[model samples]
Target: LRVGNRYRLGRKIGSGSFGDIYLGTDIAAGEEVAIKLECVKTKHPQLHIESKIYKMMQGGVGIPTIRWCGAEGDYNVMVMELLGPSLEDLFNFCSRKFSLKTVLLLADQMISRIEYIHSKNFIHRDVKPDNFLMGLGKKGNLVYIIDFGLAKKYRDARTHQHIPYRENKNLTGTARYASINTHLGIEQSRRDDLESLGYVLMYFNLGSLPWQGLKAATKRQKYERISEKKMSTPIEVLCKGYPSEFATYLNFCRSLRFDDKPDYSYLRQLFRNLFHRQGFSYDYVFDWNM
Candidate 1:
């Protein structure tokens, strides 16, 4: 299938809540791009929103470049720079774990990306390993944040003030890595994104979370159980056998007020201190390197 009269869609490369992603070539530029196709009229319409966010985030570090976007037939088609395997894929390829050095390296990039997005007044409600990806070719070492389908602006444009927190809000992210506040049906804020990042880092370090295998009769029940476990599990238990700074990071996230801005510098320092303590360099030579 063809889109925008200049791009020809190839095989479907991926699919998510928003739509299918296809491997496509820009006939004019003769370069490969990922074509995301989403039904305009769907239960959840987000392609347009994602496009707008991408535009706002253009030129920022670790963001994919938007090549094109428009309506094609019944779908909202968006073309973006093709990226390589996600951190999740790399984690599996590395036997579902990463060294402490590797996790710290990844944390540096992920925090910077999230900080940039938050600076734009938008909160990525869904922050998970799969949503963070590596760049391809010459940009292989860079990490890019993707999939803004659930992203929302938490601050009011006119007032420049944060929207008041509310309860019983619908959950909007992967259950395994969602923030505890998110599970309680509270409105998601920037801190929730950081909290989710904490979970991802823990997963990369430990290979799994304590709530990974909980069973329930229904999906909702299962998530509820996981949330309960997440709340009940002490920070010491969760961060046990790992660096105490991991606990410090999550504690800081939990202590944040709804309207409070995160101390990105301090957070980055946490990882930087860890890296320095372990005598590692900022060379970006990841564990995958031979």
Candidate 2:
């Protein structure tokens, strides 16, 4: 099938709540691309918002470049640069484990990505290993943040004022990596994104979270049980036998106020310190070796 009269869709590469992703080629530029198509009749409006966020993030590092967006029959199609396997895929390929060095390296890049997105006044409500990807070929060492469907503005862009927080709100992200505040039904802020990243880092380092195997009859029950487990487990227990800075990082994120700007540099420095202590160079070679 053709989209926008300039891209020919090939095989379907992926599917999600919003749409199906197709491997496509941009006829005009003669370049390979990933086309995300959301059926308008399905009423999954998040794809529209995601396309807008891509426009807002144009030229930003660690994000996909939106090549084109328009309607194709009953679908809202967005064509973007094709990326490589996700961090989750890599983790699974490596036997569900990541070296401490690899986790620290990824943490540094992810912190920078989150800092850039937050600078635009938006918080990525869903941050998980699957949402982060490594670039292909020459950009292989670079990590890119994808899937902005759950992203939202946390502050007023014009006034630069933080949005007021509320409780008992709808949950908005993956339960395993979601923040305790998210599970508690509180409105997520930039801090929640950071908190989620902390969880991702621990997941990478330890191969699993303490709440991974909770049993529940229903999906909602499972999520609620996982949330309870996350809250009940101490940070030290979660980060035990790993770097002490991991716990410190989680504590720092939890200490921030809803309106407070995160110390991105400080967080990056924590990972950098770990790198230095281990005598590892700043090279971006990940565990999977691209």
Candidate 3:
């Protein structure tokens, strides 16, 4: 069905607890885009939250521009720029896995964009591989962060008075990469979001999880292994035969301590070192430059 004059819903791309995403055609722009159709049964306030966050991020780096948002019958719809396959799709393009250099290059762009989102007082509660997409352009490819369903804007007292600095009761993020604090039902901060981003970077570079051996076990069993017993998995398991430089960067990115963790400047430095060591040169450091 047609929501606006241009967007014609073609097929279902994906669906979540709250909404169904569709691959739609933008006849006006002569391109394809995704339309996230919120279910009529969903809470109005929750649906508006995603729209508000997307609207705030308009023209922001690394985020898709929300082309249009309105109601179609009983469902609310959000039309956003359609992107190509995810990083997971490009996993084997370089090697069986991505190099530390490539991971950092991507991380730099993702973190820089996350910083901008935080500057606007919004925390991207969900930071995972599927949430990120790459474009199919001639000049390399473009990276865009797609989902904002869990994004939260934190305005100070003057700007927002009704909301208090309270904890988020609901678990609002992905399970695999969620910070310990996030899993503990604590309110997410900019630091937690960055830590999640680090996990994404590590996942791409290693092509596996730190707890890769636990795949055969049930979720309860995996949680038991991680929590009840303290067993340290060797970093080598993630990326065997990886260079020392890459190892160092991965360690820093996976760090949980906010203040103790390496900042973007330090991370950028590691990317430069790896890029030079690999003898690969690019016009710009991050994907945004693409």
Residue pairs in clash, model 2: none
Q: What is the lDDT of residue 145 in candidate 3?
A: 79
Off by over 4 Å in 1: 40-43
The alpha-carbon deviation from the true structure for residue 156 of candidate 2, after best TM-score superposition, in angstroms, is 1.5
Clashing pairs in 3: none
TM-score of each: 0.96, 0.96, 0.77
Which is the better candidate, 2 or 3, if ranked by TM-score? Answer: 2
lDDT of 2: 0.89
Per-residue CA lDDT of model 2 for 44-118, tens digit only, reads: 476778999989987889889999888888888898899998999999999998888899889999999999999
User: Where is model 2 poorest over a 10-residue stretch in terms of lDDT?
Assistant: 40-49
- Model 3 regions lying over 4 Å from their true place: 4-6, 43-45, 92-96, 136-140, 154-170, 212-262, 283-290
Better of 2 and 3 by lDDT: 2
Backbone clashes for every candidate come to 0, 0, 0
